[PDB]
C-alpha cells in the first residue's frame, strides 16, 4: 500500500541533531522493508488552525510503499524518540 | 503568508454533493481574498496511524497566499459545514 508519513520534529534542534533524526527515520523505513518513494524536508512550519500552545515544528514528509500489516510497528518505532513529536500516517487509498 | 489548507470532507458524499462542497471552498478562499496557488483533490484516504474510530475521509489540499490576520476567520468559515469534518492550516514559514 502507498502511505504518506508526516513527521513533526522538535523545532529547537540544531542541524547536527536534525541530521541524526533524519538518518534514523530513513534507516527505520528501510529496516521495516518500506520502499521510499519521496522525501520532502519541509522545515520549520507553524500550525495556524486549530490553535495549539506549541504550534511550531520541523516538518518532514515521506511517501512510501509497504505492507499494511507492518505500518503500525513502523510508526510506533518512529515516534519513540523524544525529538519526534508527532507521526501521522495516511493510506493513499481505501477499500 | 503562504499556507497549506488541509480539508477532510465526509467520505460518504456523492460527487454531486462533493462538487458543491468544492465550489463553496473555492468561493470562500476568493471571498476572503486568498490567492489560490494549487488545488489537489486527493480523494478517499484512510488514517492509518494514530487509530481513529472513523478513519476514512475525502481529502482536499490547497496552497494559498493570504494575510495572517484573515486566516482564522477563513478556517472557521470553511469548517462550519457539516460535510467538512476537519480543517487544518499550516503556515509554510515561521518567525
Amino acid at each position: 500500500m502507498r502511505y504518506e508519513v508526516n513527521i513533526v520534529a522538535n523545532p529547537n534542534l540544531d542541524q547536527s541533531q536534525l541530521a541524526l533524526e533524519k538518518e534514523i527515520i530513513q534507516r527505520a523505513l528501510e529496516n521495516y522493508g518500506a520502499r521510499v518513494e519521496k522525501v520532502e524536508e519541509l522545515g520549520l512550519r507553524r500550525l495556524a488552525y486549530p490553535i495549539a500552545k506549541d504550534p511550531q515544528g520541523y516538518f518532514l514528509w515521506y511517501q512510501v510503499e509497504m505492507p499494511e500489516d507492518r505500518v503500525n510497528d513502523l510508526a510506533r518505532e518512529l515516534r519513540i524518540r523524544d525529538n519526534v513529536r508527532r507521526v501521522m500516517v495516511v493510506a493513499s487509498t481505501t477499500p
Side-chain angles (χ1 to χ4, degrees), chain A:
Chain A
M1 160 71 71
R2 192 165 302 120
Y3 298 92
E4 296 182 8
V5 181
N6 302 267
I7 299 176
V8 183
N10 181 348
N12 303 295
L13 296 178
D14 68 34
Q15 286 286 330
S16 170
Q17 295 166 324
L18 281 167
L20 172 67
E21 300 299 336
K22 288 189 289 166
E23 291 169 15
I24 287 172
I25 291 157
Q26 180 71 33
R27 289 189 190 273
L29 296 171
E30 295 183 27
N31 279 357
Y32 279 81
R35 183 178 185 89
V36 184
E37 303 180 326
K38 184 168 170 84
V39 179
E40 198 162 346
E41 183 175 5
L42 303 169
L44 203 57
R45 297 195 165 183
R46 175 182 54 87
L47 184 69
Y49 177 91
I51 309 299
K53 170 63 117 314
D54 299 299
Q56 289 197 15
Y58 198 95
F59 286 62
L60 308 170
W61 182 93
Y62 302 77
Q63 188 177 54
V64 306
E65 172 68 39
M66 69 182 294
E68 170 71 39
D69 55 354
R70 303 283 63 239
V71 167
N72 180 268
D73 287 341
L74 170 61
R76 290 192 299 129
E77 167 97 1
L78 292 171
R79 67 84 164 91
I80 199 61
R81 290 183 60 82
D82 287 350
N83 285 332
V84 174
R85 291 188 171 185
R86 306 199 278 269
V87 177
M88 188 181 65
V89 184
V90 178
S92 302
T93 191
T94 71

